Design a protein around this ligand. Structure first.
Ligand SMILES: Cc1cc2nc3c(=O)[nH]c(=O)nc-3n(C[C@H](O)[C@H](O)[C@H](O)COP(=O)(O)O)c2cc1C
Ligand SMILES: Cc1cc2nc3c(=O)[nH]c(=O)nc-3n(C[C@H](O)[C@H](O)[C@H](O)COP(=O)(O)O)c2cc1C
Lengths: 199, 199
């Protein structure tokens, strides 16, 4: 039935929650997978996929290695863009905001709530650095996989997370006659301003 | 069998061609769909999906409306990133380069080789501008769909294309034990330098 303004919820997260729910129901691979774009010191954008782990009015959260390229880029420029590649369902959601670091209390909590093999793998790689061979990863994994025995596997000091604020949330949905529906929610004065955008 | 350096082709496009071919064979929705990231005058990155239409050593090509936000952003900062969200196949390909405008000869050629209903739709929308109602699109479409009769449908002066140069091409492929394989090809002195990156 297309996407009409009169049917839009006041809070964009209500629409996002609905769409995310429908993506899970349609069994898309990694429905929480989103492409995060950051920008380096030279004005060059970079992209990579990460998984959305939690979200609310304060923003969308993902975890990563603090020595990674995306982390170094965010430290120099906190402005990021997030895009949910849901084109298989003829949809896209894009979020614009600032990335802020999570506290260790938050990171520890989430970290110890995930499968133990994932807790162990977080220790393995010096994410994004050049390495001379795959073997380096394999050896370290074997070492950690035994040195820990997985007693409770501690939080690496280089593991962290970012919360991206919700400054703008844009929805795209395939439309009849290829006349696609686009709505931009823009945070303005403690409220959301909504505008339809030409496709 | 994982991705080992000894098996990598000298030209990254050889690997890309192979992966793209396998994505089509696996019937992924829009295998040519890629997320293009651009940056505005304030250092804010923006993203949206577009379709890869052609590619060779000079770069990857997509078409769009010249009055769109991505076009305005490229005019101020030609640095872009392209990402193929092929995670359903446990893969990602990211391309870093500069976007350059295509000539009208090239644009006309491609434009007149695509279905006539798509040629007509290109005229409809003032892409990315705020519009007060969906009806604006519908009325214009009806008008154009009859004013043209589709005789041969002319090229809109505001329709164009960009070719993104190949400065860096990065491949990501899911690995055993979640130890993913990443290879970065970087254009250096008329050649490609290849490095494995930690996951
Ligand atoms: C489906 C999927 C989910 C991923 N999730 C994460 C994640 O949540 N955090 C992370 O650090 N990397 C994740 N990655 C790997 C990133 O895409 C990227 O390879 C890595 O974070 C290093 O990026 P960087 O070098 O730009 O910093 C994921 C990859 C795929 C394909
Ligand atoms: C699968 C898919 C393919 C698309 N292909 C194109 C394209 O090739 N060119 C284009 O201008 N927009 C395309 N779009 C629409 C863009 O994502 C975006 O809505 C539009 O270009 C305006 O972006 P901008 O406002 O950032 O400039 C596509 C959307 C989807 C979901």
């Amino acid at each position: 039935g297309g996407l009409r303004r009169r049917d839009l919820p006041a809070d964009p997260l209500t629409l996002f929650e609905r769409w995310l729910s429908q993506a899970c129901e349609a069994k898309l691979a990694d429905p929480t997978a989103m492409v995060v774009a950051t920008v380096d010191e030279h004005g060059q954008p970079y992209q990579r996929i990460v998984l959305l782990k939690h979200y609310d009015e304060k923003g969308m959260v993902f975890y990563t290695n603090l020595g990674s390229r995306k982390a170094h880029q965010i430290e120099n420029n906190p402005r990021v863009s997030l895009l949910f590649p849901w084109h298989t369902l003829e949809r896209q959601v894009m979020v614009i905001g600032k990335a802020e670091r999570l506290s260790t209390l938050e990171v520890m909590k989430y970290f110890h709530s995930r499968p133990r093999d994932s807790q162990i793998g977080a220790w393995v790689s010096k994410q994004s650095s050049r390495i001379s061979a795959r073997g380096i990863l394999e050896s370290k994994f074997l070492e950690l996989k035994q040195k820990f025995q997985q007693g409770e596997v501690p939080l690496p000091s280089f593991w962290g997370g970012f919360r991206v604020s919700l400054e703008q949330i844009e929805f795209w949905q395939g439309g009849e006659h290829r006349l696609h529906d686009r709505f931009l929610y823009q945070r303005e004065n403690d409220a959301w301003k909504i505008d339809r955008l030409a496709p």
